[PDB]
């Protein structure tokens, strides 16, 4: 005889962070489309974070990213081909620099998605962080057109919001793409357009930067006769909409009563 309705050994039950779940789902969505996930370093060179992406200093466009500038020596920032690069250190303001690193280290055609923690000097409120996550996308190859960028996002939406979802593209500006664009997806439930991220056809100058850096490293040009599209989307804003989180500050808050709430989710 035993009271079988009696509690059992208190073995701990784990869980994954909301961002991990969201990032995972996103990565799966694109894996099904032939994209592979790779990461980049959080501490970057001004060259990779800005210059290589067609974003020079004193440029009005560089104001789109409030940079955290770093200092200190003894630190070894390593480049794409493992080599020891230089440049003013800073915390990457977006995952974009990674599409330059990847391109100098591989050859087209290819599909990549790169998730990552990004940093920006900004005031932390209920829907704004200085430390958040993005998910970049980059598909390069001969004959790649903007019709493909639009199809990718269409697929992203369907996968994220169902058959009654739909995408919308509006021209927007980014120094690393041309044509450039911002896209929104239709959220049937909340019944409204969510501005998800920006995108566009990789910029001529970005390809040139890649090949120039390649030469300097002894590699042969690989992006002379190919085109490609890239995109980037904020993760928290989407995780919040999706998991119904009211305050973006929770993610990095570390509160268990909060985190524990996502054990179930997948």
The phi-psi region of residue 154 (left if phi > 0; otherwise alpha if psi is between -120 and 50; otherwise beta) is: alpha
Residue 11 binds a second copy (CB under 8 A): yes
Stretch that binds ligand 200, among 21-29, 208-216, 227-235, 238-246 (CB under 6 A): 227-235
The C-alpha angle with vertex 138 and arms to 132 and 140, in degrees rounded to 5, equals: 170
Residues 56 to 95 in contact with ligand 200, rule: CB under 6 A? 94
Give the CB-side neighbour count of residue 252, counting CA atoms within 13 A.
Answer: 16
Residue 187 contact, options ligand 200, a second copy, none, Cβ 5-8 Å cut-off depending on partner type: none
Give catalytic status of residue 32 as yes or no: no
Q: Which residues contact 232 (CB under 8 A, 6 or more apart)?
A: 94, 95, 96, 134, 135, 136, 137, 197, 198, 199
What DSSP designation does 221 have? P
- Helix (H), strand (E) at residue 146: helix 146-161
Residue 174 binds ligand 200 (CB under 6 A): yes
Residue 223 contact, options a second copy, ligand 200, none, Cβ 5-8 Å cut-off depending on partner type: none
Residue 32 binds a second copy (CB under 8 A): yes
| Residue from 112, 113, 167, 199 in contact with ligand 200 (CB under 6 A) | 199
104, 114, 177, 185: the active-site residue: 177
The angle, 0 to 180 degrees and rounded to 10, between the axes of the packed helices 97-105 and 204-216 is: 50
Task: Give the interface with a second copy as residue ranges (CB under 8 A).
Answer: 11, 31-34, 36
Active site members = 65, 94, 120, 134, 177, 230
Task: Give the interface with ligand 200 as residue ranges (CB under 6 A).
Answer: 94, 96, 134, 136, 174, 177, 197-200, 230-232
């Amino acid at each position: 005889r035993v009271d079988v309705s009696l509690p059992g050994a208190s073995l701990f039950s784990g869980g994954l962070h909301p961002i991990t779940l969201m990032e995972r789902e996103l990565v799966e969505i694109f894996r099904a489309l032939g994209y592979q996930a790779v990461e980049g370093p959080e501490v970057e060179s001004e060259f990779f974070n800005f210059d290589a992406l067609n974003i020079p200093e004193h440029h009005p466009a560089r104001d789109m990213w409030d940079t955290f500038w770093l200092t200190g020596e003894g630190f070894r920032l390593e480049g794409p081909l493992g080599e020891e690069v230089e440049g003013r250190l800073l915390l990457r303001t977006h995952t974009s620099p990674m599409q330059v690193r990847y391109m100098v280290a591989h050859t087209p055609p290819f599909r990549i998605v790169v998730p990552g923690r990004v940093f920006r000097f900004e005031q932390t409120d209920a829907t704004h962080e200085a430390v958040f996550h993005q998910l970049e996308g980059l598909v390069v190859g001969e004959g790649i057109a903007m019709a493909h960028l639009k199809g990718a996002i269409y697929e992203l939406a369907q996968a994220l919001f169902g058959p009654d979802s739909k995408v919308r593209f509006q021209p927007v500006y980014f120094p690393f793409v041309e044509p450039g664009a911002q896209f929104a997806v239709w959220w049937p439930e909340g019944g409204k357009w969510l501005e998800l991220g920006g995108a566009g056809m990789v910029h001529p100058k970005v390809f040139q930067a890649v090949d120039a850096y390649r030469e300097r490293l002894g590699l042969p040009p690989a992006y002379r006769g190919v085109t490609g599209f890239a995109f980037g989307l904020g993760v928290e804003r989407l995780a919040m909409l999706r998991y119904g989180i009211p305050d973006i500050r929770y993610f990095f808050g570390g509160r268990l009563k909060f985190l524990e709430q996502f054990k179930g989710v997948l």
